[PDB]
């Protein structure tokens, strides 16, 4: 008895490509994809070059052509250079990325004046996403309502943070979120396991209040999507360890034990997959696609996934019940059990079809 | 030929009693207002042990009746334990300080709830300010939102942050802000000279474009405030510098300076040290009160003021013109040139005067 879900919307992904692709590339990150029932991704900016400019967006857009297998969107980034001169391609991205906190020298933007500007600037129907963490979610949603417009807050991860959206969402602010696996079913408590390089992560690690906080409040978590940041084991375990976790083949069988045990429904699990990843994000519905789900089989997650490039998962030895059997995309068979079956290059630009495209008034 | 201004409020001071006293007390840190032309000041609550509840409320107030030689405020200090037991004694107080960057172990919060409870749980008539800067002051403009009542930021340093209440205040928000003079007269051009233990001040000196910055919104500063903040030169020069400037005595004077030049008016320098203090504290007029300057005359600013116990400061070799010749304090000669003649415990808690109550609805 397998279950039929339609095709699942990973919101926040990175890809590696250009220029990091030793981490993941676009066909191994969009396999990891397939296998973890994802049938679209969109693709953050923090690549080498940056996602920041015209001709960078130009170049990342042919290397995800020829290269993924499942449909996509690429994000652009925000800098300190860029507001106001992204016009002409800004329907064609997923989105306007801010990175608000940590970030390297092409992100990193000094001042809230430089929010503003962007918020002012980016076409007011086009989405906004940021990394805002603790009180940057307040200072966010501050500029979203003195520009007028709606903001979607990536990675929630503290109850801090849950609350204040929640807070935002009583008065009517327009205001969506989303949150990753790792803040759902790891914490505080398996850093020991994990060591300080492997549970490098930002943002960081909960305590168990953070997570209990996320679940008590689910109804507030408009998406889940991985944040899939993959890096090396050496890199992961080396002297300055850069922070992220891979995702995308572990994020659905997570969610499908949590669905097993009770925890939420599958409705749940299927609006912050597929439904509301769509809306906010105005991607378009993918014709002939489904995931068959076997939610029976019971297993141990093993100290590396088939597909990333990463090669390792803070998830290991987490017992799971719930696998991905089989994936259909646009009328081929791109997955079956272990083995992906679409070619680099399978996938498609979703913001270049008829449908992908954001309504705006004339 | 004198001029003779109105008593002039200082909104922001650190006195030090009780528990700091060899930085200064009562006694000596309002000799040092007089001095510098103030006759009303609103002291914080960072004092050990902290004004934190009532019965630290009650012994800073007698303290302060005892020692303090002009009229008086003084805040309470929100903390992650009190909100919601403030309540009988927060019309007695100035307002409600919130710290919400740095802090010592009793004003520290670590959650923008913990605002969100202060916000709700304080008197809504009632002042609250805050130090808060860079994307802080978004972040707490945010909570004041949520929770639909004003806020007062606190000696607002940079560019970004007055762009950013400008903004506030053209969308009509109800946001005051006071400016100290370091963050007008010295910038990280004054660094080399000061060095890096006397230099230590939160906000920390701006650039020369913060500085150009302040100037050219001088419109958008509500009040001046001098967050004298009085460490001995032993604390500053030391190991583990605290930060901090005194400022009373030189505060007037500087400012006297950039009015001879044409900076700023006399009128915009009198709505900033008395009559905006006055309508965002709710503090009274002060009888037969007044202040007698002499702007013609030059002088060199020392290596210390006469009266404040840090006895140094950041603003030695700067060149003034004007100074406070007379003060007189509800009838009663209580400075000239160079001399306070009223005693410790003649200043008043202006919160107890009947003019001095916050106007409530029943
Ligand atoms: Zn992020
Ligand atoms: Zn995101
Ligand atoms: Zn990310
Ligand atoms: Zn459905
Ligand atoms: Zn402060
Ligand atoms: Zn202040
Ligand atoms: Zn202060
Ligand atoms: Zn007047």
Chains 1, 2 share one sequence.
């Not at 297998?69 to 002409?88: H, V």
């Not at 017992?319 to 089989?326: A, E, F, I, L, Q």
């Amino acid at each position: 008895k397998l279950v039929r879900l339609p095709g699942l919307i990973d919101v926040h992904v990175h890809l590696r490509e250009p220029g990091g692709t030793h981490k993941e590339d676009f066909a191994s990150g969009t396999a990891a994809a397939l296998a973890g029932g994802i049938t679209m991704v969109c693709a953050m900016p923090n690549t080498r070059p940056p996602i920041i400019d015209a001709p960078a967006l130009a170049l990342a857009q042919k290397l995800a052509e020829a290269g993924a297998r499942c449909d996509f969107a690429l994000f652009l980034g925000a800098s300190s250079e860029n507001a106001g001169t992204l016009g002409t391609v800004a329907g064609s991205a997923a989105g306007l990325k801010l990175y608000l906190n940590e970030t390297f020298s092409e992100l990193r933007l000094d001042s809230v004046v430089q929010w503003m500007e962007h918020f002012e600037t980016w076409p007011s129907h086009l989405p906004i996403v940021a990394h805002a963490e603790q009180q940057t979610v307040a200072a966010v949603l501050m500029v979203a309502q003195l520009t007028q417009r709606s903001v979607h807050i990536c990675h929630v991860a503290r109850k801090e943070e849950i609350l204040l959206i929640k807070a935002a969402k009583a008065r009517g602010l327009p205001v969506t979120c989303e949150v990753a696996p790792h803040h759902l079913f790891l914490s505080h408590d398996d850093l020991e396991r994990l060591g300080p390089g492997k549970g490098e992560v930002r943002p960081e690690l909960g305590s168990r209040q953070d997570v209990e906080a996320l679940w008590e409040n689910m109804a507030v978590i408009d998406c889940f999507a991985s944040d899939h940041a993959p890096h090396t084991l050496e890199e992961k375990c080396g002297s300055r360890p850069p922070p992220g976790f891979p995702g995308l083949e572990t994020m659905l069988p997570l969610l499908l034990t949590a669905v097993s045990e009770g925890r939420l429904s599958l409705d749940d699990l299927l609006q912050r997959l597929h439904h509301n990843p769509r809306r906010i994000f105005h991607l378009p519905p993918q014709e002939d696609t489904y995931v068959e789900v076997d939610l029976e089989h019971e297993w141990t997650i093993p100290s590396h996934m088939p597909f990333s490039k990463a090669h390792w998962t803070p998830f290991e030895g987490q017992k799971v019940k719930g696998t991905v059997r089989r994936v259909v995309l646009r009328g081929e068979v791109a997955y079956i059990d272990g083995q992906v079956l679409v070619p680099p290059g399978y996938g498609q630009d979703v913001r270049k079809w008829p449908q992908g495209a954001v309504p705006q008034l004339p």
